[PDB]
């Protein structure tokens, strides 16, 4: 879809393995916010949404938190506290047909900037001048949408760039989708390196009598350490204590 009306798709109940994605294409831009790309495997994600659009080569930099531009103001804005990864690659092969392709649009004029994760599909005439045009195009009023016009002979700055933006939250809810690491056995009442739904640490876990709400997976009594976790395979609740304790 065009950048003025970006498509948002919910990804859930699968395995977020990007190891298959090297052979499909090479991403020109792959930079993550609030999460590291190297640590993208050993984590589990609560809610994942994919935002997809098509922009140019001189426009990929505007898809970032705390960045200005005509797309950042009028087409697609990212929040300041954004936790996600932006995936972008050149697509001059498929999207850019011969004679130009004019199926991708961008909103050139708007009254003001956009709040983050907000789309505007209204096609009403922008009243640039003081006089109201009232539904006709002419002087001092323009159609807000403009055509990209991708042509294979353009430079890299005008080549098509397919962008998929993944928005996800870390460790606040049950995790439906995460990576390729294989689950192992559970060793209770022992000091062991544990990884529960992407939460890694060192300690000894015991059985707990706590009760968890269905929207709660991670608990804190004192908000500096996670007291208890719900195991992803078996629904029993196991409270985690530090490995070395007693104060000798």
């Amino acid at each position, epitope marked *: 879809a065009s950048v003025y009306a970006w498509n948002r798709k919910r990804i859930s109940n699968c395995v977020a393995d990007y190891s298959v994605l090297y052979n499909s294409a090479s991403f020109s831009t792959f930079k993550c916010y609030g999460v590291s790309p190297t640590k993208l495997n050993d984590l589990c994600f609560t809610n994942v949404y994919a935002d997809s659009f098509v922009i140019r080569g001189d426009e990929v930099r505007q898809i970032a938190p705390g960045q200005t531009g005509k797309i950042a103001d009028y087409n697609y804005k990212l929040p300041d506290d954004f936790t996600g990864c932006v995936i972008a690659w050149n697509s001059n092969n498929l999207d850019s*047909k*011969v*004679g*130009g*392709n*004019y*199926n991708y*649009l961008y909103r050139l004029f708007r009254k003001s900037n956009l709040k983050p994760f907000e789309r505007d599909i209204s*096609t009403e005439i922008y009243q640039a001048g003081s006089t109201p045009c009232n539904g006709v*195009e*002419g*002087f001092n009023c323009y*159609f807000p*949408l*403009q*055509s990209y*016009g991708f*042509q294979p*002979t353009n430079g890299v700055g005008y080549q098509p760039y397919r962008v998929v933006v993944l928005s996800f939250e870390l460790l606040h809810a049950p995790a439906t989708v995460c990576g390729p690491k294989k689950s192992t056995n559970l060793v209770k009442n022992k000091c062991v390196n544990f990884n529960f739904n992407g939460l890694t640490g060192t300690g000894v876990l015991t059985e707990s009598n706590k009760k968890f709400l269905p929207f709660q997976q991670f608990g804190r009594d004192i908000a500096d350490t996670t007291d208890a976790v719900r195991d992803p395979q078996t629904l029993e609740i196991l409270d985690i204590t530090p490995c070395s304790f007693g104060g000798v």
Partner: antibody
Amino acid sequence: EVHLVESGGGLVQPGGSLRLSCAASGFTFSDHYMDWVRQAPGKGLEWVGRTRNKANSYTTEYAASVKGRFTISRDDAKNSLYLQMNSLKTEDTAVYYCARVHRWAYCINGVCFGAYSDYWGQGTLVTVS
Amino acid sequence: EIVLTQSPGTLSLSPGERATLSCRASQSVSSSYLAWYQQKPGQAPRLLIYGASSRATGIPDRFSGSGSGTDFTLTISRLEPEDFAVYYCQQYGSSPSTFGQGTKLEIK
């Protein structure tokens, strides 16, 4: 490559009725938008009408001087393009070209982005007197 | 409606040298959506330039057009005897599309 072959021309009295057809081959005739452009003998080209595909459900737009007097239609099954001739005046004598708009043009609301003509047919000289 | 005025109306040049062609619009067309056509007398016009600067398929680098806003220029170089035609400008950014009156180019 692309072949727009036309039919239905002839000499007609003013105020009569007549039917035109353009046959097409060698390309996806369903996908492309289409135009009618007329050329009066010794005068410049003049646009007549434009038609859409299934995505806009055969939406038709006309020129100001031909609104209400002409009817354009198309059927992609037998690849036949039609225009209906009605209420003829002496200004309607011309050669009629049915031309092919680029496939990758897009039309949003009213404005059209990239809709240029790409291929043209030979046309017939219709005469009204 | 956008009125296109082509000037000058009559061109008659020998093969080899430089000739210029102009189409002037009554109002500023949207995003340089102008076309360029040639019509040899026995056959319909053919696409040359789309977007007023880009060449069509099968069209060599000889066929050169330029311009923005309201002033545009089509420039033909190295004319060959087969180049005789009438040249038209068509606007297509703003509906309805409108053609100019045309410039007649003759090869000596």
